[PDB]
Design a protein around this nucleic acid. Structure first.
Lengths: 141, 124, 140, 71, 104
RNA sequence: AUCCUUAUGCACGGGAAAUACGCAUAUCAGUGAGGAUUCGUCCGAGAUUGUGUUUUUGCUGGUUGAA
RNA sequence: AUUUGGUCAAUUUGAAUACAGAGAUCAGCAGUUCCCCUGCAUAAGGAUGAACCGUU
RNA sequence: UUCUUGCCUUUUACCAGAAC
């Protein structure tokens, strides 16, 4: 029922979820207030305020961020300062190192036709010189 | 100065004690911040006692909770500061209502019970 | 763009611009305001300029207005850009065979940026020349 | 206010120093509130050791004092 | 800028094999081991020592602190219990000592 | 005086991750952020925007070369 | 059927010198965040022990 | 200049045809 209200359904669909949520809570608050009140009081100032707030919220949600001042490319200097290592640090860097098997693969034997693998997606793949010659001749690793 | 309809307002020391309990409750996941959560707790029956805020403005968003408590026979207080309550709960934002809930096996059961007793004494 | 990139008025101004940027590189588009190619270049450079504000400044120049610098291209006068660092003119060997100036529109913003970066690097090294990472040959 | 006037420069740094002091006095829940810091000072008073730790806190909470000393 | 201390590499028995800033790592292998183990012990010992110090200081504080705290009591909780007999010593003792403890 | 629960502060030690961690004169937020759902209801704390670093910060050691 | 896509930069110049352009590689440790354990402190909050009688 | 072929990959200059 609430989602089909004017208060939500006037705004864009971007906002509806958040707007709906807002409405629920404010609606609840309003109800509580009503319950609290005695008959023939009809204050209805709090509700007005809530409505105003809701409207404001809606407006904010519809409005986007002001354009970003295009973040600059850093003054290209080519620093090689770092120079570190550590059981700690060498792990992380291990994830970004080419590992020894990959290095081996990258090596291709000169005369020989190099060991490929036929991935059904693409045969192209070069298993390279990660498999030892004898090993390759026999089988896998 | 605090609202008349915010009743019973807890005495300074008592208030402090309540806050401490809440903090403990927060730590233990025994506590439920906020009007709506508090209301839910009451409905469930899990609420041991309800801690409200005198400086909740507009007060009347609060004032169902007391009624609910009365109808459920649950002790309830107001403390004076919403901000303080929020802090106790572990929320930088103003909290106005909270519920310390039931859990027999809690470390702080005894503390909670004490606070409940105090609250009851306040009521009349 | 007209509004975005600063345009220069007279040869003196241009000279000042070329001199003054000690830290950054200076990209001067020399081009006749209303031409297609020139316009395209300007558009491209608008995009680039904001990105590369930290290492290279862009400026535009109406070549029919400011006739002081027909030393720079021997009175050929297509719609060009020119590169400067520490008042030293910066040579960028594309495929084109005019290493002095890129007298051709490059459509890729990123590519343009890359070339600018390259020339900046060269300047920093002191290398008057630099070989572009993109071959061209076709545009000319 | 009087107390603040005499010893307390009453900036953020000073406040931080004060806070640190109460922690070292042996705090758990954030020491105490500060209406204008006077209350906090009063609370501290039982510990009775105010002036030393603010002269230490500026050496730590930045290193500017240290730098100055060096120079 | 101060150079007041200098930070040495925190060896252990797993770093032992890979630390070479301190010399003697293979040259004097058992010596190296001793050094590293010793260092570890010191670290542990230091921690323990620190804890001990803390314990001491706290203890020192507490006695003083109690003496200091002669606060003005605002309101007093009371409880009165009555019993039919207590010919047991033990109960009496409990009543005594507990009371003494709790300033009751 | 002994034992234990909670939180935090300091630390021994051990482990994982840094595609992670911040920062903001921002905007909004237990007076509901964001989510669940068997649709009855349930959970309940960040979200938005901006931005800084992020194949890393600070420090060491070696071989080496350089020559 | 011809041809352009083919200019080393740098320095000394009023063509000569240069001759492609000027740290690498291996390894620690600490920090940053989160987690777990451990000891201590701080609050709080328990639980429990200990002979035997006390104080105007 | 525009469209279609062929050099092909670009500047001419062309290959070989249309339209203005």
């Amino acid at each position: 029922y609430l989602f089909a209200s004017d208060m939500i359904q006037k705004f864009p669909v971007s906002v509806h979820k958040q707007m709906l949520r807002m409405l629920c809570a404010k609606v609840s608050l309003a109800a509580r207030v009503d319950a609290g009140q005695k008959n023939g009081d009809r204050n209805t100032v709090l509700a007005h305020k809530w409505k105003a707030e809701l409207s404001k919220k809606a407006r904010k949600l519809s409005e986007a961020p002001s354009i970003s001042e295009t973040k600059a490319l850093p003054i290209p200097e080519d620093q090689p300062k770092k120079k570190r290592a550590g059981r700690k640090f060498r792990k992380y860097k291990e994830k970004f190192r080419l590992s020894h098997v990959r290095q081996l693969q990258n090596r291709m034997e000169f005369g020989k036709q190099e060991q490929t693998v036929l991935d059904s997606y693409g045969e192209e793949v070069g298993l390279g010189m990660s498999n030892t010659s004898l090993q390759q001749a026999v089988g896998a690793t | 100065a605090p609202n008349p309809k915010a009743f019973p307002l807890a005495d300074a020391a008592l208030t402090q004690q309540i806050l401490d309990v809440v903090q403990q409750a927060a730590n233990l996941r025994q506590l439920k911040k906020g009007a709506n959560e508090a209301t839910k707790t009451l409905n469930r029956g899990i609420s041991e006692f309800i801690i409200m805020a005198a400086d909740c403005e507009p007060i009347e968003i609060l004032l169902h909770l007391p009624l609910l408590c009365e109808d459920k026979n649950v002790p309830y207080v107001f403390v004076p500061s919403r901000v303080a309550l929020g802090r106790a709960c572990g929320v930088s934002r103003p909290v106005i209502a909270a519920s310390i809930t039931t859990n027999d096996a809690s470390a702080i059961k005894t503390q909670i019970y004490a606070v409940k007793d105090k609250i009851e004494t306040l009521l009349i | 763009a007209s509004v975005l990139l600063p345009q220069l008025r007279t040869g003196w101004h241009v000279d000042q611009a070329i001199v003054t940027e000690t830290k950054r590189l200076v990209v001067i588009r020399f081009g006749r305001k209303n031409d297609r190619q020139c316009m395209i270049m300007d558009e491209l450079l608008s995009s680039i300029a904001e990105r590369v504000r930290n290492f290279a400044v862009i400026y535009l120049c109406d070549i029919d207005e400011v006739s002081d610098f027909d030393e720079m291209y021997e009175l050929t006068d297509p719609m060009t850009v020119m590169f400067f660092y520490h008042n030293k003119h910066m040579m960028c060997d594309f495929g084109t065979g005019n290493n002095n100036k890129l007298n051709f529109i490059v459509d890729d913003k990123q590519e343009m940026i890359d070339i600018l970066e390259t020339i900046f690097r060269g300047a920093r090294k002191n290398k008057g020349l630099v070989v572009s990472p993109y071959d061209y040959n076709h545009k000319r | 206010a009087k107390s603040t006037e005499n010893e307390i420069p009453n900036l953020i740094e000073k406040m931080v120093a004060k806070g640190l002091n109460d922690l070292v006095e042996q705090y758990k829940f954030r020491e105490t509130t500060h209406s204008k810091r006077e209350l906090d000072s009063g609370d501290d008073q039982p510990q009775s050791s105010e002036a030393k730790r603010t002269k230490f806190s500026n050496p730590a909470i930045p290193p500017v004092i240290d730098l100055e000393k060096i120079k | 800028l101060g150079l007041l201390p200098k930070p040495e590499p925190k060896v252990k028995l797993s770093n032992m094999m890979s630390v070479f800033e301190n010399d003697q790592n293979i040259t004097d292998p058992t010596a190296w081991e001793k050094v590293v183990k010793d260092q570890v012990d010191l670290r542990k010992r230091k921690h323990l020592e620190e804890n001990e110090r803390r314990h001491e200081d706290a203890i020192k504080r507490r006695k003083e602190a109690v003496n200091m705290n002669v606060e003005k009591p605002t309101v007093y909780h009371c409880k009165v219990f009555q019993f039919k007999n207590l010919q047991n010593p033990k109960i009496r003792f409990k009543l005594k000592m507990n009371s003494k403890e709790l300033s009751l």
